[PDB]
Amino acid sequence: RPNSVDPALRRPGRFDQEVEIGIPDVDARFDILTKQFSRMSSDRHVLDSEAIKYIASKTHGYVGADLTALCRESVMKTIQRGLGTDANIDKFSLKVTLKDVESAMVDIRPSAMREIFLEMPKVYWSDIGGQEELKTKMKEMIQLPLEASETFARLGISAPKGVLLYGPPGCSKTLTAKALATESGINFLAVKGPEIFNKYVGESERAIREIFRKARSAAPSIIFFDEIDALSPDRDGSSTSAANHVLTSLLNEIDGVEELKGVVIVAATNRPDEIDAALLRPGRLDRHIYVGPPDVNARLEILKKCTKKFNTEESGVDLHELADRTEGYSGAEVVLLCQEAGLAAIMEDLDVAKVELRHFEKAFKGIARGITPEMLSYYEEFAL
């Protein structure tokens, strides 16, 4: 914690140059693991200089100390595996294979991940049905700047820093934000919501510095802001008094990230008035993304996603008819149809993977849909 050190000892004349150590990337992971397992050397004989690449790609976000802990738990996977078959088996002759290393990640909690208390139930692109148009725009504004960051420096094109999502409730929103990091992505960090106010005055103020203390973690770290209403819901345009200083700290630490650095602000919200008249400045939020209701084609893929286990075709249910009649449902409202339909089907008589068309109809009449998907009267021209 260099910031926790007294600034008197950090003034010029004491340490002119300091180096901030970041999280090793995929290129550095092979070099670390090669030398760490160089002590193992041919005892494994399963390396082939290619097995580490699979491990390094899967083991993402590791600070580096846990890489040695991976080796310690790898030995735990073996030995016991050998002793499981034979009681007097020679432990020295046993070797570690790819299966033991992969299974070790189950009982391994990375030190960096332990601090960042997140759940992230392994969301992939399979669950995100439809929104093909949405993916292309996000890739051209997020994937390319992150992967080709060195290229953008020579090109000189200003990156569209600052991404915000506004749309009807039930859409992906946060779902797409956390899914990108899964497929060969980078570290994702988000707040828990009740973090702006903790207790005493100044304890939460210094917590803002602790959040931004890590700054770029590997290449780089991203600090998402889900539920932006938790930061500045009021006390800005009315009843300010002397309690709006917390928002000032969160806004003075975001302009020091330059443009072509990779550190951007990504947030998800539903009320445009919660954006507040402070992020419309030229450099905070210049481009606006509207995640509207899915079209008919999107629901067709979503329906198959939420009816994968259901026979559908075997029972005699047409998927195209369901997608057309599900118009007006916004995102999650489409998915909820099966769950309500599933409960009715089971209660009939010991339902085992037998869902008919009438089950969809029964649940269709007892689910409410979104109302007024036009936001707070302003969604195109961000000028009030």
Ligand X SMILES: Nc1ncnc2c1ncn2[C@@H]1O[C@H](COP(=O)(O)OP(=O)(O)OP(O)(O)=S)[C@@H](O)[C@H]1O
**Residues marked as binding?**
167-174
Q: Which does 305 bind (CB under 5 to 8 A by kind): a copy of itself, ligand X, none?
A: ligand X
Report the C-alpha gap between 358 and 361 in whole angstroms: 5
Q: Which of 213, 194, 215, 195 is nearest to 204 (CA)?
A: 195
Query: Per-residue contact track with a copy of itself, 77 to 116, x per CB under 8 A?
Result: --xx----------xx--------------x-x-x--xx-
Number of H helices, E strands in the chain: 15, 5
DSSP 291: -
Q: Does 16 bind a copy of itself (CB under 8 A)?
A: yes
Residues within the annotated binding site for ATP? 167-174
| Residues between 35 and 94 that touch ligand X (CB under 6 A) | 35, 64-65, 68
Closer residue to a copy of itself in complex, CB, 49/194: 194
| Cβ neighbourhood burial of 380 (10 Å; 0-12, 13-18, 19+) | exposed
DSSP 268: E
Q: Does 281 bind ligand X (CB under 6 A)?
A: yes
Q: Cβ 120 to ligand X, closest distance in Å?
A: 13
Query: Per-residue contact track with a copy of itself, 354 to 383, x per CB under 8 A?
Result: ------------xxxxxx-----------x
CA dist 88 to 77, 78, 79, 84, Å?
17, 15, 11, 10
Closer residue to a copy of itself in complex, CB, 47/280: 280
Q: Does 11 bind ligand X (CB under 6 A)?
A: yes
Residues 283, 161 contacting (CB under 8 angstroms): yes
Among 1, 6, 7, 13, binds ligand X (CB under 6 A): 13
Tell me the residue nearest to ligand X as measured from the CB. 331
**Contacts from 205-212 at CB under 8 Å and sequence distance 24+?**
205/245, 205/246, 205/249, 208/249, 208/250, 208/253, 209/3, 209/253, 212/253
Q: Does 328 bind ligand X (CB under 6 A)?
A: no
Residues 171, 291 contacting (CB under 8 angstroms): yes
Between the CA atoms of 210, 212, 214 and 220, what dihedral angle is there, to the nearest 10 degrees?
Answer: 160
Mind spelling out the 3-state secondary structure of 334-370?
HHHHHHHHHHHHHHHCCCCCCCCHHHHHHHHCCCCCC
Query: Per-residue contact track with ligand X, 233 to 262, x per CB under 6 A?
Result: ------------------x---x-------
Q: Does 300 bind ligand X (CB under 6 A)?
A: no
| Residues between 186 and 225 that touch a copy of itself (CB under 8 A) | 190, 192-206, 209-210, 224
Report the C-alpha gap between 299 and 365 in whole angstroms: 18
Query: Per-residue contact track with a copy of itself, 33 to 72, x per CB under 8 A?
Result: ---xxxxx-xx---------------------xx-xx-xx
Among 309, 313, 324, 361, binds a copy of itself (CB under 8 A): 309
Q: Which of 165, 187, 220 is nearest to 379 (CA)?
A: 165
| Residues between 135 and 174 that touch ligand X (CB under 6 A) | 167, 169-174
Among 28, 32, 51, 76, binds a copy of itself (CB under 8 A): 76
Closer residue to ligand X in complex, CB, 329/355: 329
Strand order in the sheet with 289-290: 188-190, 222-226, 266-268, 163-166, 289-290
Q: Cβ 171 to a copy of itself, closest distance in Å?
A: 9
Task: Give me the count of residues in the chain.
Answer: 384
Closer residue to ligand X in complex, CB, 167/272: 167
For residue 57, give both structure tokens.
């790609």
Q: Which does 340 bind (CB under 5 to 8 A by kind): a copy of itself, ligand X, none?
A: a copy of itself
For residue 304, give both structure tokens.
């198959």
Closer residue to a copy of itself in complex, CB, 296/353: 353
Q: Which residues bind ligand X (CB under 6 A)?
A: 8, 11-14, 32, 35, 64-65, 68, 127-129, 167, 169-175, 226-227, 251, 255, 268, 270, 278, 281-283, 294, 302, 305, 331-332, 335
